[PDB]
Amino acid sequence: GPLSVFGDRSTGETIRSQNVMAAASIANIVKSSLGPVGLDKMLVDDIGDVTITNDGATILKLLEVEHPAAKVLCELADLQDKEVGDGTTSVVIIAAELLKNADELVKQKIHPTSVISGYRLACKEAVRYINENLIVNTDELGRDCLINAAKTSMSSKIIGINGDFFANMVVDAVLAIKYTDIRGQPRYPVNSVNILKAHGRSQMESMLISGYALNCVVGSQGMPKRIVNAKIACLDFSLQKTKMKLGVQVVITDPEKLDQIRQRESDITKERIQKILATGANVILTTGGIDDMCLKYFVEAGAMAVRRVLKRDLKRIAKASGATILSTLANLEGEETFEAAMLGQAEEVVQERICDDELILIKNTKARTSASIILRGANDFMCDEMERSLHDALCVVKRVLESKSVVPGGGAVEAALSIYLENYATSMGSREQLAIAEFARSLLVIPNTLAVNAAQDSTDLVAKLRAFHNEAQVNPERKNLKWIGLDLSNGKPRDNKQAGVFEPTIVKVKSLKFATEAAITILRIDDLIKLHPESKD
Amino acid sequence: MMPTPVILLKEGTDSSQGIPQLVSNISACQVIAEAVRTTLGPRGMDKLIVDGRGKATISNDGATILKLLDVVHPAAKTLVDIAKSQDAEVGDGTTSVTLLAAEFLKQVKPYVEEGLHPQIIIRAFRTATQLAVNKIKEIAVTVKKADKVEQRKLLEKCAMTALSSKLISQQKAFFAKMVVDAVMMLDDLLQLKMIGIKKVQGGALEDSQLVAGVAFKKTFSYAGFEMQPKKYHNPKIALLNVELELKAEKDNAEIRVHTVEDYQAIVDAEWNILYDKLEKIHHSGAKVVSSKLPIGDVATQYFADRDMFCAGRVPEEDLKRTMMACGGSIQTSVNALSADVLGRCQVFEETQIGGERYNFFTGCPKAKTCTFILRGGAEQFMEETERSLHDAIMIVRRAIKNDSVVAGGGAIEMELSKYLRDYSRTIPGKQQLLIGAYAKALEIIPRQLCDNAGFDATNILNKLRARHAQGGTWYGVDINNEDIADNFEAFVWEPAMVRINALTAASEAACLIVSVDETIKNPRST
Amino acid sequence: HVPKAPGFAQMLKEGAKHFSGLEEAVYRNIQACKELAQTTRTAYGPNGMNKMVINHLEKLFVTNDAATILRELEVQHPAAKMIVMASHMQEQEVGDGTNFVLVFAGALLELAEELLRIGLSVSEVIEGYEIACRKAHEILPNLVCCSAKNLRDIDEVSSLLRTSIMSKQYGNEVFLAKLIAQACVSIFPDSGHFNVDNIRVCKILGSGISSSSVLHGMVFKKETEGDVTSVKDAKIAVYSCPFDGMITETKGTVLIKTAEELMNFSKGEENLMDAQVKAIADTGANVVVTGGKVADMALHYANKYNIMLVRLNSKWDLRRLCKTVGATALPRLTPPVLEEMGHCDSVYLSEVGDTQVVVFKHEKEDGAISTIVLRGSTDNLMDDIERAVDDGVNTFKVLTRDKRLVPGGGATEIELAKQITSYGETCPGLEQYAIKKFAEAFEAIPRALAENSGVKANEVISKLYAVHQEGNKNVGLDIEAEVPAVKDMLEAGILDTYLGKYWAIKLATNAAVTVLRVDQIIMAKPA
Ligand SMILES: Nc1ncnc2c1ncn2[C@@H]1O[C@H](COP(=O)(O)OP(=O)(O)O)[C@@H](O)[C@H]1O
Ligand SMILES: Nc1ncnc2c1ncn2[C@@H]1O[C@H](COP(=O)(O)OP(=O)(O)O)[C@@H](O)[C@H]1O
Ligand SMILES: Nc1ncnc2c1ncn2[C@@H]1O[C@H](COP(=O)(O)OP(=O)(O)O)[C@@H](O)[C@H]1O
Ligand SMILES: [Mg+2]
């Protein structure tokens, strides 16, 4: 008679109501961590680890989910870090409210393919309207655009101070790693900034190290820990005793030739260490291993040798100091040449005190003048929060300098799109106009969440918010009310042009493209079959 | 991990707080509204609920379905009590009260998640309800030519729509004619105990009938009932409350005798006590005897020899209907029997309807009661037919004392959305998002008339909002044709107090769900 | 390996715990009573929220009154029971202000924790609270501005009863004020004792609150067992014996010795019952109400002589019927009633809300007793209006005992916060800190009124002290809309229970003092 599957089958409006409650179970979590009045959470594990964070990606990655519609919204937050980097609480609330308003349409016996086709006409029109209603590029504002866009990202986190201490350190970090490319591409690789953590003084003592901050120790306590006018030798091979390979064995037939082979394992080893040290090299960085026999040659000659450094840290030092990453001997059948003209340069390599640990600093690197940020917090829970908040702040200034276009934040984009799409649904709307009209109400949840978390008036402040944006579209008298946002500290609509509340363009363009595409896949689960777990057979 | 005291809070109780509590109450009312959602409209199906004992009850009434779900949710019990009060006040407002009260919470469900302290929602719900129950009274039509054939036609149209959405398809013209004729035979009290609805298994719905008199089920008799033939052209009924047995003992009598000459005189006196009571029933014309107390083998054979009929162990609910049918009086003592206490009928026979025997009375013109015998093919089929009969009786019971009727279907629920949206555009403040949300919540009654049979319900609401804003105010949803139609001209009528008590009970239930902010449950459940 | 700490001096219990000191006993009693103050803080005021409380009997109670919530919550903390029994004494004394006790004594213990952790011990916070409590009873007669004396009729008490109604029924403040005005004034004893037990509530399930009314009489929920339901003369003979005859007491045994005594016993018993029913029919009686059962022979002659029978199974409802129609329950069998007959106007039956009721409706002589017939959509709604009805009857008994009133709505607690602070600054001692903390407990009572209205309590409490500059003494809170700009309470008419404010301050002070006296707690094993 029925289906003889050994799992479970649920059809109809059961799964159509379960996917909305699965998406609302995720959105109601992250609704309390949006905007400058948002608050952080606690993520306690079974082993006892506590993670205090408010970013939309760190919470949903550590949180376990079971529903298939819940894994779509959790993987939607992971894509926002790679594509944009701060846009990762706002996408989850929009994509869940896109399913909440579309559930009210399919309960009115409206076909979901008209809602899918109605959402594509509203998503492509939202990108078209936001690209024709921008204020200015990065020429008029200058450095004031980079600082004000950085403070908007920090307002939802622990580094949202009233001053410009953390804002100036981010702009000075991205501007110091300007790496040009072919065909006129000024790239800004923000992954080259080594963000370090140390439980020390307050947040106002966060050092901006112009150069690189290596997270390693010297090793042997007989080397000079401060070298002025240093020459960095970046190399990746273990400075240990000469061990033969698997194909080579030592089969001796004469007992007199025994001790000459035993001394040869250290003579070939020390032959490399004397030709890399006679060329003026004082700092040697190694990703392999330097044993206790080879540490004597640096104490005797007065050189610094750092062992077991990361491979991702050696590439950031050799590119910034002009050093060449050498793995072995080379240069056309040469015995030991080392190409001594390709040594790195540094002004000062100094191991400072980082509150009961050792940290090596390189000052200005003499070639590229890179930057590294050492964070200072109260405990380890604040340092993990300060690292995530700084990494999201580095991604904001990266997209502004690459794509010179900013949009007003604080719900100013979602207020203008809530009224333009209602007029867009009336012109060319015959049967898909109800999906475009619900696309505007789903976008209004971003200024609605700012009024809930601020404990302000909800149905009056957003009603006063769209009152200025309606007069900016139907009354062409140059009212300039396209930048009207929210003042959550006062509870009144303010102008985000003069207040300095700036967000990048692709933090909302890619947010509206990812949330609309995720809402289509969850809208097509009218039939769902769940099989039994095959564990013990 | 937070609460770890030495002395706990109360015992172990959990309590939600704030905005997650209120959405938990609104979404709970949406689940219990699905059990009355598919039972609306003439194209609405019924539901079958089986309990733990295995008893099946198939019905579509809101007062029958919601009482068998065994709902233990605190907020969802509010929608069950308004379905019970609608059956107690009106009788046919049941599925519409539960579903409309759930829409009052779902239309404010995006509003309660974003601010909007609920004292503004309670004030807006009470304001829109008082304007809704006043526009019904100002538009409900009435007549000034009653006590004629036109008033009986008004009672028949309200009973056909009350018999709609039931298990009756083509028997609307047959059953609803009997419902109007049932309440017109009653007195000026309209008591529901003055009409017997008895279910006889076997026969179609066309085999049912409305007896002008009464009829009982012919309960357990004794030897002598195959005699006493059932042909009476003008009998008299003796309603009694006495025992006609030889063993009538007062349970405290000790008859101490001394000799054998007086011992036989006691046994002869015990037969003379019973035979003197039978001589009082005799010599008075009372050929039919009815008593709620049992009759032994002695008085059964005495009436068979004197060509008299009797019936013992009659239920007390049937003797009260028998007293108002024949116009007599129940006499406990047989010494005061006369012509003023006996009944009078014309046709009294014992038929064989459905296999079981039934002693029916007919022919009495001064009949203040009636009996509607139901014939069906199943026990659950006749229980639904009895439940559908009570909804048509309680509609026509209230229609006599208040003949103000309105249009059926979604005609009133759509035009109340017109008068409330026009009122919401004339007041400032936050009430434009609440009075207008109250008007959009009333549009689900024409939605469930269409969603149960397709009908393209999105396009049919654009025709309803355009017709009510242009011309008449009684345009609703046609069931046979997939179009809008004037329900007042199509004789789809319902009394005005059906929708007045529906809007009043749904608003007071919706104001109670939004007013509770904490729910504390004690774990002691024994 | 790992050692452990054993018992030291008096560990002799078999599973019981022990508390001693300030941190283990005194500070934990404060934090337990603070959780009850924060629980009922949301349900306090006219904008309070209801609470669906389920007891151990698995039934639902939804209300906003703090007295009926604590009766269903199974509280197990011992110091938390002291603030519950103090609120239960407010219901027994005046019947209103039970929640005022949880806010004031919850703030008295909370501010006492700030004094024990900064300063003086319990020997001076208790003595400091008692000085400010005696001074608080000297300002309350000075804050009386109006009185319930002139025109004691249904017009003046319709406005003086709105404050007790709007605190629990905000939208129905106009309908319930008129229903409590036509019931409490109609049972006036002509300058005597006002009994609150003479007002009953008949819950009839049906339509909404607009169809509720007050009937001058009593409404029961039983049947007739007869056909004489239309009674217009209404001469009621009330009996307490079972209306089935006169039986003996010890054993009871019919002794038959001949055939004549057996045949005449059944006919002689019917003639004996016939003479007793016709003895009350010749006296003009129409309604015969009994307490016990009624035999079939009594029902035979009740319908013959055309008299109505009423069955009352409850013995307490029979005594209320004697005060309704003015009769006397006779313990013996039916006599010729000389002067203890009842006299009503119309006794009939009607099925209202699918419930056949018996109504003893008085038409001309209206004032003997009153019964408010409440209508509701749910049974849970009618229990909440009944609590609001009983708060209106209990407020009418307060105005009988003392006709003085004080302006509520936050106006009284600010003036009590200003005068106690004036006494605290003029006290040259170390106990002046507890006097200043006693006035701040009155400051938190209009704070709960503003937090329940969605208004910021910092700007609300700042405007109250700014307009109380030594001569106003009447401005309270305007909770009708946001951005309040608060108005006068005498112009709005928000003033209630001066005697309620006199007892709620005294009970909450003695409750908070009794908690601070507890220094050592010895509990037993719960079983
Ligand atoms: N000063 C401000 N005024 C108003 N709104 C602000 C201000 N600063 C930040 N916001 C709002 O707070 C929101 C924070 O979003 P966020 O959680 O950072 O997104 P994501 O999770 O993608 O990084 C932004 O959408 C922005 O509109
Ligand atoms: N002939 C008809 N045409 C259109 N609609 C009808 C017709 N007959 C009944 N209806 C609709 O069916 C619905 C039945 O409601 P019902 O379930 O009886 O309410 P309740 O449960 O309160 O008795 C009514 O609201 C009415 O509008
Ligand atoms: N119209 C009004 N305006 C302002 N405040 C009011 C109004 N009506 C009542 N209140 C306030 O609501 C509170 C209700 O207190 P209540 O809970 O009745 O105390 P209790 O529990 O002792 O009866 C009162 O203290 C009063 O100040
Ligand atoms: Mg009160």
mmCIF file of C-alpha atoms and ligand atoms in Angstrom, chain C residues 43-46 65-66 90 96-101 163 166-168 170 408-410 413 445 449 477-479 489 494 501, ligand 3:
data_model
loop_
_atom_site.group_PDB
_atom_site.id
_atom_site.type_symbol
_atom_site.label_atom_id
_atom_site.label_comp_id
_atom_site.label_asym_id
_atom_site.label_seq_id
_atom_site.Cartn_x
_atom_site.Cartn_y
_atom_site.Cartn_z
ATOM 1 C CA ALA C 43 1.882 42.104 37.737
ATOM 2 C CA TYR C 44 1.753 45.257 39.902
ATOM 3 C CA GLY C 45 -0.252 48.261 38.762
ATOM 4 C CA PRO C 46 -3.005 48.936 36.227
ATOM 5 C CA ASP C 65 -3.580 39.769 41.808
ATOM 6 C CA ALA C 66 -0.584 38.905 43.989
ATOM 7 C CA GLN C 90 -3.591 42.076 54.002
ATOM 8 C CA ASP C 96 -6.705 45.086 48.863
ATOM 9 C CA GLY C 97 -3.027 45.942 48.684
ATOM 10 C CA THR C 98 -1.570 42.439 48.917
ATOM 11 C CA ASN C 99 0.928 43.239 46.351
ATOM 12 C CA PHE C 100 1.920 46.379 47.857
ATOM 13 C CA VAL C 101 3.360 44.221 50.639
ATOM 14 C CA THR C 163 -9.160 52.471 41.359
ATOM 15 C CA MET C 166 -8.612 49.410 36.926
ATOM 16 C CA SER C 167 -5.626 47.835 38.714
ATOM 17 C CA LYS C 168 -6.719 44.355 37.574
ATOM 18 C CA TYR C 170 -8.047 48.095 32.972
ATOM 19 C CA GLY C 408 -2.761 56.790 45.030
ATOM 20 C CA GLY C 409 -1.080 56.114 41.725
ATOM 21 C CA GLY C 410 2.341 57.060 43.085
ATOM 22 C CA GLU C 413 4.629 57.076 48.189
ATOM 23 C CA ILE C 445 6.815 51.656 44.478
ATOM 24 C CA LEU C 449 4.314 51.512 37.955
ATOM 25 C CA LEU C 477 1.575 59.089 37.551
ATOM 26 C CA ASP C 478 -0.107 59.365 34.144
ATOM 27 C CA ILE C 479 0.362 55.934 32.568
ATOM 28 C CA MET C 489 -4.658 62.575 41.016
ATOM 29 C CA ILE C 494 -7.271 58.001 41.565
ATOM 30 C CA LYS C 501 -2.204 51.987 53.102
HETATM 31 N N1 LIG D 3 -5.475 55.260 36.943
HETATM 32 C C1 LIG D 3 -4.283 55.007 37.530
HETATM 33 N N2 LIG D 3 -3.203 55.779 37.279
HETATM 34 C C2 LIG D 3 -2.007 55.545 37.852
HETATM 35 N N3 LIG D 3 -1.792 54.534 38.712
HETATM 36 C C3 LIG D 3 -2.786 53.681 39.055
HETATM 37 C C4 LIG D 3 -4.115 53.874 38.468
HETATM 38 N N4 LIG D 3 -4.900 52.904 38.970
HETATM 39 C C5 LIG D 3 -4.143 52.149 39.805
HETATM 40 N N5 LIG D 3 -2.879 52.617 39.856
HETATM 41 C C6 LIG D 3 -1.769 52.046 40.659
HETATM 42 O O1 LIG D 3 -1.752 50.620 40.562
HETATM 43 C C7 LIG D 3 -1.387 50.045 41.820
HETATM 44 C C8 LIG D 3 -2.145 48.742 42.056
HETATM 45 O O2 LIG D 3 -1.772 48.176 43.307
HETATM 46 P P1 LIG D 3 -2.421 46.781 43.775
HETATM 47 O O3 LIG D 3 -1.695 45.663 43.069
HETATM 48 O O4 LIG D 3 -3.920 46.901 43.649
HETATM 49 O O5 LIG D 3 -2.054 46.719 45.339
HETATM 50 P P2 LIG D 3 -2.618 45.520 46.254
HETATM 51 O O6 LIG D 3 -1.939 44.291 45.699
HETATM 52 O O7 LIG D 3 -2.194 45.891 47.656
HETATM 53 O O8 LIG D 3 -4.109 45.559 46.022
HETATM 54 C C9 LIG D 3 -1.679 51.095 42.882
HETATM 55 O O9 LIG D 3 -0.573 51.225 43.781
HETATM 56 C C10 LIG D 3 -1.922 52.391 42.130
HETATM 57 O O10 LIG D 3 -0.976 53.393 42.516
#
